[model samples]
Structure formats: C-alpha cells, structure tokens
Target: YYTDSRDYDNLRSLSPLSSPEEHKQDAESEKNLKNINPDYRFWIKVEGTNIDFPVVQGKDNDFYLHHNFNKEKSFSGSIFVDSENNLNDDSNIVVYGHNMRNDTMFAQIKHFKNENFFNANKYVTLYREGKKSTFEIFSVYQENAKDLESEIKTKFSNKEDYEKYLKEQESKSLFKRDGIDLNSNDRILTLITSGYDFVNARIVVVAKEID
Candidate 1:
C-alpha cells in the first residue's frame, strides 16, 4: 500500500514554498509551461493541503487523465477542467484529478469528510494570468459519477434556477457551512476525485469565488 506522506516527494517538490524567491521561481516555471502548452491554464491550490498542481485542459478530457504536466505517462495525472467548459471563464468550472492512494493528487481532499478539517481548510485558491481568485468552500458531498455530471449545472436559465441549484447542492452536503453565502453572480468551482468507497462514487468539493 502507498503511504500518502512518504510517496509524494515529487508533488511536494512542485508545490510553492513559503519564501518569496521560491514562489517567484514557481511562477516562472508556470509561465514557461503556459508558453509551451497552450492547454496549461490555472494553478489550483487548496489552502493547507498537498492539492497544489497545475490545472490544464486538453483536446479531450482523457488526454490529461493519464498524462502529467509534461504530458508524460503517470498514474497521478494533471488536474484538468471538464472539456465542455472553457478555461478562459465559466460560470461553473469543474476540475478533476486522480485520487492517488499515496495522498498526492487529491487523496488528501478526503480529509474534508472530517468537520474539523473542513473548517480549518475551507479555501481554494486559483491562479491565472497573474491574478488570484479565492473560493470559499461551502459544500462537500459524495455523488455517483454519472449522477454528478448531470446534476452539476454550470449555466442556469435564470436567477431562480440558479438559486434552486445552489440550494439543492447545499442540501446534499455532508455538513453545514454557515455564513458562506452563494449567489448566481459568483463563479462556481468544483473539485472532484474518486471516492473511497462504492464503485462510480466521487468525492466533490464545491465553492464559489469570493471578491
């Protein structure tokens, strides 16, 4: 069995460090990657977790399912956006990554199941084009893959429908998150990974960007 902490050296190396110099270097690296691969998009960082990785887009979703940032074959693939959604901007953006047993990719996200952990680390920061957008987590749930895709609505017909969508997602959450208000005008972010149990089940974390 893979030990989550010990086996994630490579990913840890990729993570930005606390020093300003280190962060600048990482920014340069990401900039070069963007120039090399137009698909290279956002840098996703879940505050207080090892979920930091470059978010990319491919011609099809499958390309990054097994390919890393360098487009190399790896079980721990790159975090990628849904092919149907545009990376430039979208009302509802869904990002996916493998749930590596080693606790690298998105396995650490499962910790959200614990209420304390969820409260301590409730922010998801996304970086793009020198700008950073912070999203506050409000809902976390487990849904079957098939059901999740259909249930997640990126575009609503109107404000009423969007309000209903937000309410429905909150109702499905495993725990309550008070004080995090979500509105239709806000952009939604969904982070998805394979669930610990039940075939076809997925662990999803939902949040909306805060000004």
Candidate 2:
C-alpha cells in the first residue's frame, strides 16, 4: 500500500479542481483560448509549482518558443507541446517552456532538482478540453540539451524499446523511488525547460500517466 500523502490517486478523491463544474469551466476557457490562437491545445498544472499554464502547438515548435500565449513576440515564451507528438496516439509527449530570469515560465522547475521538493510534490495533471489525465513524476535531471533532445521520441516500435529508454532515464534521475513501477507502452509526459547548468543544458522531468 502506498503511504505517501502525495499519491495522485488518493489526492483525486479530495482535489478541488477536478469537479464536474470545474471541468466545464476549464473547457470554456480552453475554447476561448483556442479562438485566440487555434494552436492553444490544453492546460497543464504541476501542483505547488509555477507551471500552471496553457500549452500551445504551432506548425513548428520554434513559433511558441519565441511567442507568448497570445502569439505575440516575447523572449519569455508560452508553454508548448512538441509539434510532432500526437496527443491521442503518441507514447511520449514532450512539453517545453523557457527558463525566464524573472521567476516565471518554467523557472521554478529547478524546485525538483532536489529531493525534498520532488518528494513533496508528486503529481502533475494535464487537462485536455474537459478530460483530466493525471501523471506521477518519477525522474528529474539536467543533461546536455542535445543529448536529451535525442530522446524526445513520440513512439516506440518495440515494447522493450520504450521500457529500455525509461529504464535508462530512471538510472539518471535526480532521485529514485524503488516503489515506482512503470510498464511498457505506458503513456509518458515529459516537461523540459532551459537549464543554467551549462551551455546547451536542459532540465527534464519525466512522468507516467496513471489516470
């Protein structure tokens, strides 16, 4: 039995934001956001973090990297999903945001760089239209952007391939939980942000959808 207070499955029983009425409200805002820019796709919230924001997907990933939520040019860009990942079918979806110096965007992702924050905050939720998907964070690390970018694959041709990739990443996580179990073909949600660790470095958080 999982005793962690942060277990997402247990939290859903009392979490305030997933109510029916709230889903409807979230859907309305999603519709309105899309009207502003058809690329606005879904909403993502990492509890107790600074990442509650709408995610957008443009024709190419570059567009959102340099634009705001309203599609206006800005150095601090909006959160965005990988342009190539299919939300409905992809095995892994990579979401990106800038590490703004002003303490916004994904600047706070470093909160997971240490175990204390990572242990306290365990679940990240993604809302697509009115549907809610819950994921549990299991891995957080900083690595060379080029090396990390190579694993942004949305599909796994073989079952072991996906498991192998995840196993490799788990070995490199900032902290590991022996109780955390992941199966082959499980849906993966990856959050990525610029890292100041060094030139061309990136922070990556890996999670698996459970509900």
Candidate 3:
C-alpha cells in the first residue's frame, strides 16, 4: 500500500557489502583516514549505544554506494551538504538515509523520543574527512512528508535553497532545546530517511556541532 515501495525482491539479490573484499576496503579507508589526518580517532557506530561515528574519508556527493556502504538490504544513507552549500565553506551539514523495516539506518532515532532512551544516549558525533566536530541531541521528532518542516525545503539544490529549507523546518520543529541553536554560523547535521507512508512519517533529530 506504500507509494514508495521498494523492489525488495530485486534488492535481496544484490551482493552484500560485508563481503571479504568490502570489509577489506572499509578497513583500508579507516586506516588511511588516520594517516591523512592525525586527529582521526573514531569508529562508526552502527551497533553500539553511545557509539562514535568518527569522521572518515568519504565522497561528498550523493553517491548511494558510498553513503549506504552497501552493508545490508535494510541499510542505506548519504551525507551531503545542501545543494547550494559550498564545498569550501563550513556551513550546516545534512545527511540522508533510509528508514527500513528492520529498524536500521535512522529508524532507531525514534528511540530518543522516550525519556529513558534519550537519557541513555543523548549525544552523537559526526566527523568530516579533514575536520573534527561533535554534536548533542537537542531535538527528536516526527512529521508528515508534506509538512514542509525540518530542513527539507525545496529539494536542496543550492546554498540559498538549503538555508531557506533549514530555517523553515527548524522553526517548526517538534522538540526544543537550549543547548544549541540552529544558526548560519553554527554547523547543522540532519539524518533523514523514507517513512512509513508517503507523507505521514519522518523522523528528524537536530544536533549542533560542539567542537
């Protein structure tokens, strides 16, 4: 009944990313990041609470292959600046991912809504290839796709479009916090994925760079 139904049958036939070669490549990337940047001391957090998604070397474009890491059928995501964003500027950061039935990708972000879970893991870190930064969970909420809130303003084609989108959604956010403000000077990161229905659900958690 979903409008954006994926061809699971086809997806299932695809090769797994954890193949020996894939892991070898991932390990090599992780190793090279350190050699290139001495401050690189973080690992991705796909399995543990309070895990650190250390910044690593990754393509800046929206290449599904690199963002998804092709790990499993239920996982896919990408990290890219807004369409108008300058690759040279340290503006807000945005990432896109899939919310799968298996609760992989950003699906688990909803757990933050619960007081207990939020208290348990209230912080996350996002590292860039050549930059060091941190983030704290200030807001976690859900909205319909058509709501036009949460930094998804007009297709993210450029910096002005991106900023407009970010401002629009940030003002209408469901959760609130004083820890960090979503502003032009500060860097912003967004983790988004497909929702249950066409326009009924989307989880958004806004965090600010601390370092």
Candidate 4:
C-alpha cells in the first residue's frame, strides 16, 4: 500500500497523475503495464561515492532490484505496492533497506535523528503504478522488533488506542510536527532500514498521506 509512485510505475501504470497525489489506498492500480509504469520519474543518489542504484526493472531482473544483504556497505531500497491487489485492509506496506555504516542506505534515515532535516524534507513522494502519493514525515524514532510488532498488532477499537499510539510515537520521536496527522483509517507505509549496532535498532520514518 506504501510505495513510491515511480517504483509502482516500474511494474504497472494504473493512474497517470500529472502531479503527486496521496489519499486512501483504495485508488491504487491492480493491473500490470505493457511497458514500465510511465506516470512518474525515478532516481536515487548517494551523497558520496558511486553508491547509487538506477531504478530499472525488466522481466529478466527477477522482480527485485538487489536482494543481497551486505553489512559493511550502504544500500538503497524503496516503498512499492503489494501486487496482491488488496489495498483496503489494514494495509501496512513496509519497505526494507540497510542503514550502512557508511551512512548511506537508510542512513539518511539517521538524519531524522536531527530536527532540522525533518523540518525541511518533512514530506516525500512515492510513485506506484500510476499514482504518486505525497507523504509528510510524521513520527521519527528508533524502534526495535518489539516496537514494530506492537505497531503491526495495534488494534484500534476506539479513540483511546489511536491516541495512545500517537502519544507513544510522540514520546519517542526526536522530531515533532504540528500539522501531520495519521488516522487509523489511513494506510501506513513504514520505511525501515538498519540502524546502529544494536542489532534490531531500526531508524524508522513514519509518513502520513499528504497530497
């Protein structure tokens, strides 16, 4: 449910929006494209070194960019939609990347450790199929496996649970925002990559739908 629009277009072009748009996941495309998803442009650049991966996909590329896990170097991953065609459920789509020691991969994630970066690049775009969803960074925190588990299993039977989750995220968040809001009805895409040496220490950036 959470993927870059450009990334989605790589597989299929469901909607061709001239500009980025974000809303409920109900509007994502479920069909594949004859060519690549053609709605949005894709690019990835590292600050230094040639540590970048051009967003390219083909029938022969095995449906994934790179699956190898390297502990020593930085890498980049993306948020893409689930091809299963189920976007209306508790669709919590998560993308995995590495927080390389070189501070590349999800290392920019560590930038959330600072408030300035969060304030500047508070929002980002994820292109999938034919729609580009614009999201604003909501909660930035260091979470472990348990925290992630809790988030996944979090049930919202009432307003209390929803408020509690927001409060918890705020308590642990290094950066706070005034206008950002994530509702239980909203689809969440968590971009998680490696963090420091704490094993499961994950640098998490939570973004909300912002078209």
Q: Give the worst 10-residue stretch by lDDT in candidate 3.
A: 9-18
lDDT tens per residue, model 3, 1-211: 1322243222222212126676566556556545644433333332234222332223333443234333222224322234443434535454545555564445566666566675556566543342334676666667776663443532345667656655655665555555555664455556554466456687776666666
Q: Candidate 3 at residue 41, lDDT?
A: 34
- TM-scores for all candidates: the values are 0.86, 0.87, 0.55, 0.56
lDDT values, one for every candidate: 0.78, 0.78, 0.47, 0.48
lDDT accuracy of residue 43 in candidate 1: 76
Return the lDDT, model 3, position 157: 53
In angstroms, give how far residue 118 of model 4 lies from its true place: 1.0
Q: Which 10 consecutive positions of candidate 2 have the poorest summed lDDT?
A: 2-11
lDDT of 2 by residue, 1-211 (tens): 2221122123133222446677666666667767867887777889887667777897887998788766677677778999998888888888998886566778788889988899998898887856778989889999888887776687788888888988877788989855777778578889999888799889989898885
lDDT (Cα, tens digit) per residue for candidate 1, span 25-68 = 77876676687567877778898887777788888878887877
* Candidate 2, residue 66: lDDT: 81
Lowest summed lDDT across 10 adjacent residues in model 1 is found at: 3-12
> Candidate 1: lDDT over CA atoms?
0.78
Q: Of the candidates shown, which would achieve the greatest TM-score relative to the real structure?
A: 2
Q: Could you give me the TM-score of model 4 versus the true structure?
A: 0.56
**Superposed Cα deviation of residue 46, candidate 3 (Å):** 8.1
Off by over 4 Å in 1: 1-27
lDDT of 2: 0.78
Give candidate 3 regions above 4 Å deviation.
1-87, 149-170, 181-183, 197-200
